[PDB]
Every structure is written in C-alpha cells, then in structure tokens.
Amino acid sequence: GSYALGPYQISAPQLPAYNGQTVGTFYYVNDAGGLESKVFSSGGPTPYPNYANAGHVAGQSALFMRDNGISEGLVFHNNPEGTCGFCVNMTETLLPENAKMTVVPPEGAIPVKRGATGETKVFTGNSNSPKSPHHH
DNA sequence: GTACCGGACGTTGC
DNA sequence: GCAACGTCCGGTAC
Ligand SMILES: [Mg+2]
Ligand SMILES: [Zn+2]
C-alpha cells in the first residue's frame, strides 16, 4: 500500500485516531528533490467559505498546491467514512490546471453517504478556479 | 440540542 | 433539463 511521489514510495504515516475531525498528512517534492510533509486539520478559516470542501483535508491540500504552485501532491487522511462527495466533485476546481493530487483514505474505509468513496482518488486540476466569495 | 441553511460542482432520478 | 443530494462546516432556529 505505497504510492509514488516522484522517486519516493510512501505509505500511510501514523495518524491520530479519528475523533470526528479529519486529520491528514500531505507530501510533496521541493525544488531540491527532497520530500516535504505538512499536517492538515479539517475546518479552519478559509479564503473560500463558498466551497464546502475548502476546509477539508483534501481542500486545504489543494489550496496549498494552487497557492504555492506545487505540481504533484499526496495526502493521507484518517476518516473511516472516506473522502466525501464535495471533495470528489470540487477538488479539480480548487486545483490549478494539470496539478495531480492523490488522496488516500484509511484502510478498509467504507463510504456511507452519497458521493463518498473509500478508495484512493487521483485528482487532476482543471482550468477553472475557485470563485471569490461575497458577504451574504 | 437540533434541523435546516448556503455557495458550489458533478452526479443522477424523474 | 430540473432539481435532490453530499461537510461537521459555521450559524439561526425552533
Ligand atoms: Mg481548477
Ligand atoms: Zn470532503
């Protein structure tokens, strides 16, 4: 159960036991060839409150990639119900065009609501961008 | 406490 | 083609 990030072959790191708030670890490769990690916890403040997936682990990872121009990313999260339907449908919007982010739920994740998946998904970014919000 | 609410994208039942 | 449907989000309301 390992995943290819450039020349690195990475498996799931130890994540906190799911307490209701999803937590994930994100990995990318910097300009020097080294591997960098960053820990994300779902549901902080966000530039895109009009995007239901922006505050999730995969959404924060995608905005971190867009913001920093990262072309390829890997992220593991701890949610036994899997990646939700908003993530599945909106990450490619959040992503910059042709960026690749693979999202890995915990082993044996079982989706229970519409749209969710318990399987690894590889999102590739599309030319659309997140609409900037308003004060409704 | 709790049952919607609300922007938003793609999926899909009618 | 139209509209239901999907977060634990943050927010108003029974
Ligand atoms: Mg996009
Ligand atoms: Zn999600």
Author numbering: 1290 to 1425
How is this structure described in the published paper?
Recent studies have identified a dsDNA deaminase from Burkholderia cenocepacia, DddA, an interbacterial toxin that is delivered to contacting cells by the type VI secretion system and mediates antagonism between Gram-negative bacteria.
DddA with a substitution of the catalytically essential glutamic acid residue (E1347A) was used to capture the enzyme–substrate complex. The structure of the DddA–dsDNA complex was determined in two different crystal forms and refined to 2.39 and 2.62 Å resolution, respectively. In the structure with the cytosine base parked in the DNA major groove, Glu1370 side chain is pointed away from the DNA. DddA Phe1375 intercalates in dsDNA and displaces the 5′ (−1) thymine, which in turn replaces the target cytosine and forms a noncanonical T–G base pair with the juxtaposed guanine. The DddA–dsDNA structure trapped with the target cytosine parked in the major groove suggests that DddA can locate 5′-TC motifs in double-stranded DNA without engaging the cytosine base in the active site. It may represent an intermediate conformation that allows DddA to scan through a DNA sequence to locate target cytosines.
